[PDB]
Amino acid sequence: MTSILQVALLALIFVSFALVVGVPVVFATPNGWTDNKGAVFSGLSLWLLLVFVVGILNSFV
Amino acid sequence: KLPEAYAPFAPIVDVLPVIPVFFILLAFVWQAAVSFR
Amino acid sequence: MLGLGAWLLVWKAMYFGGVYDTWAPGGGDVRVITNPTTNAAVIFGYLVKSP
Amino acid sequence: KATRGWLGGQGGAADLDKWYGPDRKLFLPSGLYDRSEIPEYLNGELAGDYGYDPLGLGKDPETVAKYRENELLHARWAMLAAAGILIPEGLQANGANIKGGTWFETGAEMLNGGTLNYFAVPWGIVSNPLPLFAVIAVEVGLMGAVEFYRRNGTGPAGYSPGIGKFDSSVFDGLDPLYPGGPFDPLGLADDPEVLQELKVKEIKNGRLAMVSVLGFAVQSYVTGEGPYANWTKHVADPFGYNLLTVLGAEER
Amino acid sequence: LVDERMNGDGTGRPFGVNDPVLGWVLLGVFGTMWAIWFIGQKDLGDFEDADDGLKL
Amino acid sequence: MLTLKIFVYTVVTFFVCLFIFGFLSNDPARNPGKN
Amino acid sequence: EFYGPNRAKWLGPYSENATPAYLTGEFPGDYGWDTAGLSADPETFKRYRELELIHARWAMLGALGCITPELLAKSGTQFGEAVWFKAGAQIFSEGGLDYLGNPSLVHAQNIVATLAVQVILMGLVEGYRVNGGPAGEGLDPLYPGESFDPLGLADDPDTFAELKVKEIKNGRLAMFSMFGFFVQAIVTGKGPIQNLDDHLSNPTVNNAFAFATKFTPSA
Amino acid sequence: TPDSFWYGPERPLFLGAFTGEPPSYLTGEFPGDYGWDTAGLSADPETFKRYRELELIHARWAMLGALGCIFPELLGSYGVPFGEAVWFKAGAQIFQEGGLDYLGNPNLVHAQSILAILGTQVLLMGAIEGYRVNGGPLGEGLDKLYPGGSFDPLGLADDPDTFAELKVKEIKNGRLAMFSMFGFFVQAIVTGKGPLQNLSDHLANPGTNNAFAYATKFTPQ
Ligand code: CHL
């Protein structure tokens, strides 16, 4: 299946754009990494999940 | 070309090599934002 | 890490499909390098050779 | 007991400050998981405590200790399982006459003709003339007592099960999960601080085997081969024999 | 043939030696001057402990 | 020609070994700046 | 008996003036045999008892391991090379060194690998025997018994002193038999069980005097 | 004993850390004391003096011997026309037709009679081996092992800190050369070639030209 791979890869681009902007903002704000810790962990664990989804979906094409 | 399950993403790929030129420019923006301290 | 990285090239040439040999008989293609040259007079002969 | 160093000087249990207390290793490093976000019931009192409970399944140190009853048995069975799955497949693939060393078809290999072959390495190989009816009969009997010997707490008085002491008595005040009296023929439990460090090695070897036997069952269901066959074929051809070459194999 | 050559223009000899006396020139002159440096090493400082270089 | 080659290899290796063992003979301490 | 002055001797009854003074009978195997006087210094006599017992414990492992590959070959186990002075060369064989007969077993091919593994492993456990290691630190240099007597046989020190004599007398026989095996291989050229089988076949002719003219210098 | 790192109680020993306490008579006093007397052969402190003055003479002959066995085969590989460049065949040069030529040169020494060589050697060695025992022209009352004087013309034994250091270098160079000269003996008996030929044969293929090539060589029958 091809179309769910392209949706999952578009989603990988938006999540990566959320990390390329957001993660340096969360880091270098004062006391921002303690407050926004679980957001970035949910962002990284989604980003890492989306990479292994697209790689497994590439096997089905 | 790319594999055809990824060829719609080929517009993003043409922008990807020039990105480390923007990383040396970002060090000048960050130092301009702290006024070159 | 550089030593184990240099064994990645040896494992890929000896075991993991081989590498491209342009001097292969029959034209250049991918050749598993079954007999790599471990002779120290040949290996360290390049290093002391003139440039 | 006096424990000179394995290679050089003084050895034994150097520091248990990596495994117990506030200072100890965790499941995330200290810039991602500080010492205030550890749950209050996970303290440095159990071996292998990394502060790992994101799904709140632990409640208090008495519920954690009764799941520790479940964790350490699941550890010690999966460790015997992990050696019992790789080794007979490894011997059969290298030349032993096991006929069923692959783990997921050993049961159907011995159905009506019987005679599941057994390899007493290195003493050669022996046929096993026990029918499948007896294997169902002996196992439920011989191990239903042992799982009752851990409930009732009272072993048989006579010591005949491969004992290094021959102390024909019962011992009932022993620690659950750690009956170190008759179950230490080699000893290795006299110094309680190196015993507290060996039970860190016991649960980590256990948690490594529980993940691996889970890895056995999944990758045998997917690939259709045993884990020794998955191991020697991924080492033979890594990029061409992966998870990702196995999935989607029906198209080319 | 017509003249006399040394015949080592593209032969790839180790350090460009083809008479074995040339290798003993290399080891003799290195060995003579290693030995002068070694005997004269008592005037260079005994940098024996660990923090004993030109460091920063 | 071989007499010339032996002579040049004595000469060149004399000066190369002056170079190498000169920097091994405590060059970084030959500064005027004290520490 | 076996200790004190009123013990067994190396000449038996004709040994009352034969034994020296320092061989009292407080060490096992002391039948009073120091005819060349090598062990007169008690510091060296301490060293030679360590040299004797470690030689005894390597010869007992030797004399059992130079025999059981040749018995099982008479029972039908194929080894490649079952005779002990040919069993080293079977690692250069075409299938390597299978342990009894199974290629599912050790299946060693590289002699430099199994030697370098041995130098690392034996270099540690012979070092553990000297200074101490994981099984003990300050025990007897010849009789550790903490981890090396798991079955409790180093109890009752009266009968434990008997076990030291049973150790060395089994051990001295094995050393006398390993000196056998070496010479009965150089002279004969066949295995020691093969040396046993033809002396049991014909004791008259199949002895060591049938090979007495082997080492004659004929020039 | 000084604080010379090779002497006294905290000295390097022959099993490193696994050696334990050395024997009580090996107090770190004399050079090359790695505490290796496991046979107890030198427990007597008078035999231990004899074995010290027997080790070092063996060491000084084997250091000359190991240099003396490599050097005619090293030059023999480089075109010097020796009769036999190999060391264990170098005796038979007296038995060939032209005799024994030093450096393969016919108008150097040109020995023809082996009985003249041995008759000269017994007279000359017997004079100087006895000088090593007592007296002599180059020194009369000196040390038995380290006489100095005429046998230290460069003065390299003046500083006793340096002299106790160089005695450690002498015995370790000597024990290495005795252990290597024993290698010359065994690997000429076993292989049959020169030690520089055994080296270059090993360097051409170390996997096959090791000592296990000749492991079945002395097999009976
Ligand atoms: C901690 C590791 C360590 C180990 C294991 C050793 C071990 C040894 N050191 Mg020591 N050292 C070590 C640390 C250090 N040493 C030294 C300094 C020295 C010196 C100066 C010397 C030693 C020597 C020795 C040897 C002394 C006893 C002996 O000969 O063994 C006897 C037993 C063996 C050699 C085993 C045999 C090896 C092999 C497996 C057998 C091969 C089998 C053949 C195929 C059989 C032959 C077939 C037949 C038919 C011919 C031994 C190999 C001495 C030496 O080299 O003598 C040889 C020596 O002179 N060591 C230093 C610097 C302080 C160390 C630093 O830590």
Ligand code: CHL
């Ligand atoms: C350092 C002492 C010394 C040693 C080790 C040798 C060794 C040898 N000489 Mg020799 N020589 C020595 C001194 C002298 N030689 C000679 C004159 C000759 C002649 C004319 C000939 C020899 C030959 C030989 C070789 C016989 C071949 C052989 O037996 O193979 C087996 C042995 C080995 C391969 C080496 C093993 C050496 C040895 C067994 C161990 C060394 C320890 C000794 C037991 C110590 C003995 C020395 C004593 C006397 C102090 C043998 C390697 C013959 C030859 O070259 O044949 C090819 C020969 O024709 N020698 C003179 C002048 C008189 C010597 C003066 O001291």
Ligand SMILES: CCCCCCCCCCCCCCCCCC(=O)OC[C@H](CO[C@@H]1O[C@H](CO[C@H]2O[C@H](CO)[C@H](O)[C@H](O)[C@H]2O)[C@H](O)[C@H](O)[C@H]1O)OC(=O)CCCCCCCCCCCCCCCCC
């Ligand atoms: C075709 C072939 C072409 C030729 C081959 C080409 C390739 C060659 C590459 C070979 C590798 C070269 C690497 C050399 C590294 C040298 C580094 C160094 O600066 O090395 C420095 C060290 C210094 O060592 C230490 O030096 C110290 C100096 O002490 C002195 O000073 C001390 C206080 O400082 C004390 O006072 C003490 O008493 C006093 O002696 C101590 O003595 C220590 O014991 C000692 O370990 O040297 C050492 O470790 C040993 C150094 C290595 C050995 C050098 C051998 C040289 C050649 C010998 C053969 C010559 C042949 C002559 C032929 C004649 C006939 C023609």
Ligand code: CLA
């Ligand atoms: C050269 C690289 C390098 C080095 C020396 C360090 C060193 C350290 N890091 Mg940093 N880190 C690195 C790379 C590196 N890191 C990278 C690439 C990442 C992104 C994943 C991080 C993310 C990271 C975090 C988020 C934290 C640290 C922390 C730490 C500290 C120790 C805890 C630890 O093991 O890290 C944890 C990292 C891992 C467990 C990753 C697994 C590494 C294992 C060893 C496998 C390695 C595989 C292989 C050998 C390397 C890749 C091969 C090839 C691709 C090059 C230590 C100072 C902690 C710290 O400073 O606390 C205050 C901390 O909180 N690191």
Ligand SMILES: CC1=C[C@H](O)CC(C)(C)[C@H]1/C=C/C(C)=C/C=C/C(C)=C/C=C/C=C(C)/C=C/C=C(C)/C=C/C1=C(C)C[C@H](O)CC1(C)C
């Ligand atoms: C310590 C100890 C301790 C414990 O306790 C006990 C024990 C073990 C017993 C001990 C040990 C010991 C040992 C090791 C020994 C060894 C030795 C040696 C080897 C020597 C050599 C030794 C050796 C030597 C001298 C040698 C020498 C040599 C020489 C001179 C040579 C000569 C020559 C030459 C030039 C050349 C020609 O062409 C020939 C010839 C003629 C040949």
Ligand SMILES: CC1=C(/C=C/C(C)=C/C=C/C(C)=C/C=C/C=C(C)/C=C/C=C(C)/C=C/C2=C(C)CCCC2(C)C)C(C)(C)CCC1
């Ligand atoms: C992979 C990918 C991605 C990522 C990307 C990235 C990583 C990016 C980055 C980017 C960047 C990182 C950018 C940057 C930029 C910067 C800039 C653009 C700047 C400029 C500047 C200028 C122009 C100016 C300068 C100056 C100053 C200010 C001072 C000095 C002087 C001057 C004037 C020069 C994403 C997610 C999308 C997804 C898809 C794919």
Ligand SMILES: CCCCCCCCCCCCO[C@H]1O[C@H](CO)[C@@H](O[C@H]2O[C@H](CO)[C@@H](O)[C@H](O)[C@H]2O)[C@H](O)[C@H]1O
């Ligand atoms: C910073 C870290 C960076 C690490 C990056 C590592 C990148 C390595 C890139 C190599 C990937 C090549 O992998 C590739 O190998 C084989 C060659 O086609 C393929 O596998 C298969 O393909 C071909 C036929 O289908 C055959 O010639 C191969 O024998 C077969 O194994 C794999 O399907 C493919 O995945």
